Structure formats: structure tokens, C-alpha cells
Amino acid sequence: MFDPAEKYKMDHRRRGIALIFNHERFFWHLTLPERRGTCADRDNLTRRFSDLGFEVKCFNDLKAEELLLKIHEVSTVSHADADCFVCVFLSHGEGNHIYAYDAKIEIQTLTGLFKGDKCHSLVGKPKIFIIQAARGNQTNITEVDAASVYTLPAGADFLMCYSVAEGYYSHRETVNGSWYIQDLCEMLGKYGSSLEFTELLTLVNRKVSQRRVDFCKDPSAIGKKQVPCFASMLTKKLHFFPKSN
Amino acid sequence: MFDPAEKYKMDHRRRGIALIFNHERFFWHLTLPERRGTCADRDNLTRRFSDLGFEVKCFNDLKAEELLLKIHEVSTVSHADADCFVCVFLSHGEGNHIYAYDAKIEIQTLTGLFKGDKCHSLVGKPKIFIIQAARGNQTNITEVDAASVYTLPAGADFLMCYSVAEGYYSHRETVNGSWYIQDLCEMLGKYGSSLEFTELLTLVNRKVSQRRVDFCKDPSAIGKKQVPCFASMLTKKLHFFPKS
Ligand SMILES: Oc1cc(F)ccc1CNc1ncccc1-c1ccccn1
Numbered sequence: 246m247f248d249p250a251e252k253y254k255m256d257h258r259r260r261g262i263a264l265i266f267n268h269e270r271f272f273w274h275l276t277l278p279e280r281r282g283t284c285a286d287r288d289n290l291t292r293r294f295s296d297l298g299f300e301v302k303c304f305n306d307l308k309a310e311e312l313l314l315k316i317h318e319v320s321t322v323s324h325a326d327a328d329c330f331v332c333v334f335l336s337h338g339e340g341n342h343i344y345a346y347d348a349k350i351e352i353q354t355l356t357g358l359f360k361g362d363k364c365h366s367l368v369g370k371p372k373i374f375i376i377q378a379a380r381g382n383q384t385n386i387t388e389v390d391a392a393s394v395y396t397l398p399a400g401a402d403f404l405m406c407y408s409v410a411e412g413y414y415s416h417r418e419t420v421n422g423s424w425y426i427q428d429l430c431e432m433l434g435k436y437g438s439s440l441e442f443t444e445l446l447t448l449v450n451r452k453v454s455q456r457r458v459d460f461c462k463d464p465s466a467i468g469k470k471q472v473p474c475f476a477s478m479l480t481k482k483l484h485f486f487p488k489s490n
Numbered sequence: 491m492f493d494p495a496e497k498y499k500m501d502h503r504r505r506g507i508a509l510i511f512n513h514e515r516f517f518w519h520l521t522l523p524e525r526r527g528t529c530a531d532r533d534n535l536t537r538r539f540s541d542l543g544f545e546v547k548c549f550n551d552l553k554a555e556e557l558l559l560k561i562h563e564v565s566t567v568s569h570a571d572a573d574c575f576v577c578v579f580l581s582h583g584e585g586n587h588i589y590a591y592d593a594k595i596e597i598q599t600l601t602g603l604f605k606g607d608k609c610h611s612l613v614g615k616p617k618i619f620i621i622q623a624a625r626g627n628q629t630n631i632t633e634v635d636a637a638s639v640y641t642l643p644a645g646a647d648f649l650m651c652y653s654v655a656e657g658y659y660s661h662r663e664t665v666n667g668s669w670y671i672q673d674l675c676e677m678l679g680k681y682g683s684s685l686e687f688t689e690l691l692t693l694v695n696r697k698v699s700q701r702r703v704d705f706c707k708d709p710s711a712i713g714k715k716q717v718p719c720f721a722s723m724l725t726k727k728l729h730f731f732p733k734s
Contacts, residue, residue, distance in 0.1 A: 396641075446722075452492075475722055476641060482689070
């Protein structure tokens with residue numbers, strides 16, 4: 246009775262929550278550059294996830310204490326009547342860390358809040374983390390960052406989506422936002438409501454990888470290709486078909 | 491005109507090569523245990539990949555020099571007439587490394603041989619690495635290893651398939667072989683020729699994660715669940731439809 250086309254049950258009362266932690270500026274003593282264009286990423290994601298039925302909650306430039314407080318709140322609330330959970334980090338990072346305004350936080354302690362034991366109401370439901378984070382260097386310009394955040398998985402029924410893999414480069418337009426987020430949001434717009442979500446992330450991999458880097462205004466940006474990846478521990482096909490209003 | 495259902499071109503003369511590096515025993519001074527049951531993994535993979543049209547080349551207990559020589563040979567040969575490339579490591583590992591018989595090798599130097607620049611004849615073609623490697627701890631029994639190998643991606647058009655993620659445990663039956671390889675090989679057998687390959691790996695994630703660990707013969711094995719993962723940098727849908 247094992248079914249090769251089994252779908253996650255996506256017929257709960259609510260789609261669920263999408264958190265977006267948006268980080269544009271950092272405490273002076275961290276000496277991290279501003280992420281001009283991140284607000285376009287935040288707004289584009291808010292529209293696309295909202296249109297798929299998510300209750301989107303955005304937070305701008307939280308300090309570590311506030312960020313840990315919000316994400317613990319969301320993890321200890323009931324998801325019993327929700328299909329799934331989405332969490333987005335738009336920041337700088339290094340290895341297994343993301344930067345809040347004032348300090349780095351271990352990604353595993355954030356994903357850990359939504360694992361089986363700690364969040365019973367999300368057991369067997371998709372938990373999707375999207376991470377646009379790279380190394381902070383030091384009218385619509387393209388800024389380019391080295392990959393820095395480990396493309397780690399997170400546990401049963403987690404999907405971890407990364408803007409860039411080791412040895413590649415992350416691009417952000419200061420007005421239009423991140424290449425990865427622009428291409429993710431275009432694909433959510435056209436295909437989010439019909440295509441299997443990993444099939445859609447594969448389109449994003451193609452779109453981002455096909456962006457040409459041979460004729461760049463800045464000569465030092467030439468050859469710096471971007472290739473995203475995703476680490477799936479999903480156990481079923483994931484669709485975001487339109488819900489009953 | 492951008493196509494949301496675009497498939498990798500899988501209509502070349504040959505499917506391509508599948509390498510399987512099978513490591514059962516290790517140099518005494520490494521203090522690594524034998525991997526009893528790995529030969530079942532090697533044989534099960536050989537049958538399933540052969541049935542999908544791969545030219546399977548197996549190597550048993552190569553030392554670092556021999557392993558680097560074989561994999562460099564395969565990387566510098568023409569893949570122009572091939573659909574794709576598969577490479578399987580059945581060994582112990584730690585972090586960024588896999589064990590040959592005598593020493594550890596950086597996984598990135600092995601995958602790096604098949605990247606764009608270094609292997610022009612595989613550009614735009616799927617490069618699939620399958621890694622059954624965990625920490626060597628010091629009739630058909632179940633041995634259990636802590637996850638140890640980083641679940642890293644490689645580059646454009648690579649798919650990296652891992653038996654186990656951080657915090658989970660890898661299981662091997664000393665006769666029937668690894669849980670991950672048994673479930674992978676069952677799914678290749680039933681669905682390899684019809685299903686999209688990442689869809690099939692998702693079935694393997696479910697099969698392996700549903701294997702119960704509450705009533706184990708060894709009490710210290712209770713609660714040690716196994717969850718695999720894959721890191722995709724594929725740009726299109728990957729199918730292994732029967733060739734003609
Ligand atoms: O994936 C990236 C991305 C990068 F930007 C730079 C390096 C890597 C590869 N490292 C890993 N990838 C997956 C899981 C764990 C690690 C890891 C953990 C601890 C120490 C080293 N690596």
C-alpha cells in the first residue's frame with residue numbers, strides 16, 4: 246500500500262506561518278556592510294507567500310534576544326490546524342551562523358525549535374527554511390558576496406534552501422534585491438500554486454545559474470557565478486494548491 | 491521560451507559510467523572497524539545501476555594513490571557520448587573526508603574533477619554522488635554509526651546523496667547491507683526507470699525514516715533514528731527512461 250506519489254496533507258484550516266527576519270544594518274562594532282536591496286527581497290517574499298495562503302510575519306533588524314524570543318514564541322504556539330511552516334533569513338552569515346543586528350546565532354538552535362520532540366504540532370509537516378546569507382565584504386548597483394553559510398540539512402521533513410553553495414558568489418541589486426530571491430519570487434508567482442516545491446526550487450537553480458557574469462560594470466565581479474542549492478529531508482511531494490477561501 | 495518541465499537530455503549513445511568505491515577493511519594503524527555487509531551494498535547497487543544502462547566499475551579497498559588514479563582516469567576520458575556520471579563511496583568518513591584503505595581524501599577534490607572547467611564533456615549533464623559513510627566506532631546483526639560526513643553540495647548539475655544527516659545514525663545489517671542502500675536499491679528496482687530521480691530519493695527518505703528503532707536487540711541502539719538527505723544543484727528534471 247506504499248504510494249510513490251504520496252503528497253503531504255495540505256488541507257488543514259490554515260497554510261501556516263512564514264517568518265521573515267530582514268537584516269539591512271548591523272551594530273557598528275561588527276563592521277558588517279549594509280545590505281541595500283534586502284527590503285525588496287522582504288517585500289517580494291511577503292507578497293508571494295501571502296498569495297499562497299501564509300500568515301507572513303516580518304521583523305526588521307532584531308537583536309539576538311528579540312529574534313530568539315519571536316522564533317521561540319512561534320515554535321511553542323499550536324500549528325495543529327496548519328499545513329506547514331516557512332522561516333526566511335535575509336542577513337550576513339558565516340559557517341553555521343546567521344547575523345542578527347548585534348551577534349551571530351547558530352542556525353541549528355533555530356531549526357531545532359521546530360524538530361519533532363520540541364514542536365509536536367509540526368511532526369510530519371514540511372518545515373522550509375530559506376537562507377539568503379553570505380560574507381559581509383567589510384543607482385541600482387550589483388554587490389557580490391562570497392558564499393559563507395554551510396548548506397546543512399536540519400531533520401525529518403525539513404527543506405533547507407540556500408541562495409549559494411561553497412565556491413560560488415551571491416549577488417544583490419541595491420534596488421531590485423538578491424538574484425536568488427528575485428528568481429525564487431518570479432517562480433513562486435508563475436508556478437508556486439501548481440508545481441511540486443522541489444521542482445520549483447530546481448527552476449530557481451537553472452534561472453540563477455544562467456545569469457551571465459562575463460560583461461560586469463565592475464571588472465573584479467567577472468567570472469563570479471551563482472549556483473543555489475537545497476538540502477531536502479522531505480518524505481513526500483509538497484504542493485501549495487489553492488485552499489478553500 | 492522558459493519551460494518549467496525541462497528534462498536533462500538523456501538520449502546519448504550511452505547512459506555513462508557508475509564508479510563504486512567499496513571499503514570493507516582498513517590499514518591496521520587507522521583503527522577503523524570492518525564494514526561487514528558493504529559487499530551486499532556494492533552488489534545491490536551494481537545490479538540496479540547496470541539495469542538502468544550504466545557501465546558499472548567497482549573497486550574494492552583501494553589505497554589513496556590507486557583511488558585518485560582511477561577517478562582521475564575516469565574524469566579525463568570523454569563523456570561526450572554519455573547522459574551522465576554516477577560515483578558511489580561505501581566507506582567510513584569524517585567531515586569533508588572519505589576513507590580509502592590507508593588514508594582520508596577530501597570529497598571536494600573528488601567532485602572537483604567533474605566540474606565544468608576540468609571535465610568539459612560533462613558540462614550541463616547530471617553528476618550524482620552517493621555517499622554511505624559514517625564514523626567507524628573504535629549472524630545478520632545491525633551495526634549503528636553516528637553521522638560524521640558533512641552533507642555538502644558540489645556545483646552546477648551535481649546531486650549529492652547522503653545516507654544520513656547531522657544528529658542521526660546510519661545502520662548496516664552485516665548480511666543485507668545498509669538501510670539506505672537497501673531502500674535506495676528497492677526504489678531503483680521498482681521506480682528507477684519511470685520516476686524523476688529526486689522524487690525517488692524522497693521515497694528513500696520516507697522508507698529509511700519509517701524504519702522503527704524502539705525494539706532493538708542491543709538496548710544502546712534504541713532511539714537512534716536514520717534520516718538521509720540530498721543536496722541538489724540540478725537545473726532540470728532527471729529521468730532514467732529505458733534507452734533505445
Ligand atoms: O556548504 C558550504 C557552504 C560554504 F559556503 C562553505 C563550506 C560549505 C561546506 N560545509 C558544510 N556543508 C554542509 C554541512 C556542513 C558543512 C560544514 C560544517 C562544519 C565545518 C565545515 N563544513
